[PDB]
Amino acid sequence: LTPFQKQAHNKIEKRYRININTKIARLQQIIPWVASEQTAFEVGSTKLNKSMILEKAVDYILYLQNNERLYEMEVQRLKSEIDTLKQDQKLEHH
Amino acid sequence: LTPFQKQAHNKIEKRYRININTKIARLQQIIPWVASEQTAFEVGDSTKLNKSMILEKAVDYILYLQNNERLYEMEVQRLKSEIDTLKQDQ
DNA sequence: AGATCATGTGTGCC
DNA sequence: GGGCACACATGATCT
């Protein structure tokens, strides 16, 4: 556990910490609600903190999960409406 | 710089660290690709998910979902136009 | 070795 | 006479 060796942890662990920061920033940058903002932290006029990015990430996913429910509902409504038109048209002469 | 206010600074930092871990765990819990796994870290609540894994997956899963909406949009357009084209018959 | 996560610190902004 | 985020540098553990 010499002087060479503690410099080798503080190389490894610094990387762990900017590795986390960059993943947090990448996540911020695909969320259109917060993508443009500057950050409280070193990635490598309001500053976004790690908590807020992580909170918004969860909300932004609920939003996309919601939208998928709405899309699978929209689809069913439209397929349903196509069905009723095809029936009405098939059975009018009858 | 003193025993009682040392003590307090840590009390604080522990809470900050558990807030970040709980937020990461929530982000995990909403991503069905990873939601039911174990965690490498303490939440304030056989191999364990790590922080960066949850972060990478959250980005993977948001791209997936954004990409699917484009497919959903197309499915909707194809249907709306199939309706257009039945109704112009009357 | 190398990654990871937990613990104390010191710093700087509100 | 305060809390906060964040960075840093260690210690402990696991592959």
From Swiss-Prot, chain A:
Effect annotated for changing residue 15 to A? Does not affect the DNA-binding affinity
Compartment list: Nucleus
Q: Superkingdom, according to UniProt?
A: Eukaryota
bHLH domain residues are: 4-64
Subunit organization: Homodimer. Efficient DNA binding requires dimerization with another bHLH protein.
Q: What other remark does the UniProt record contain for this protein? A: Present with 486 molecules/cell in log phase SD medium.
Return the protein name: Transcription factor TYE7
Organism whose genome encodes this protein: Saccharomyces cerevisiae (strain ATCC 204508 / S288c)
Phylogenetic lineage: Eukaryota, Fungi, Dikarya, Ascomycota, Saccharomycotina
Coding gene?
TYE7
**Where in the full protein does the shown chain start and end, and how long is the full protein?**
177 to 291 of 291
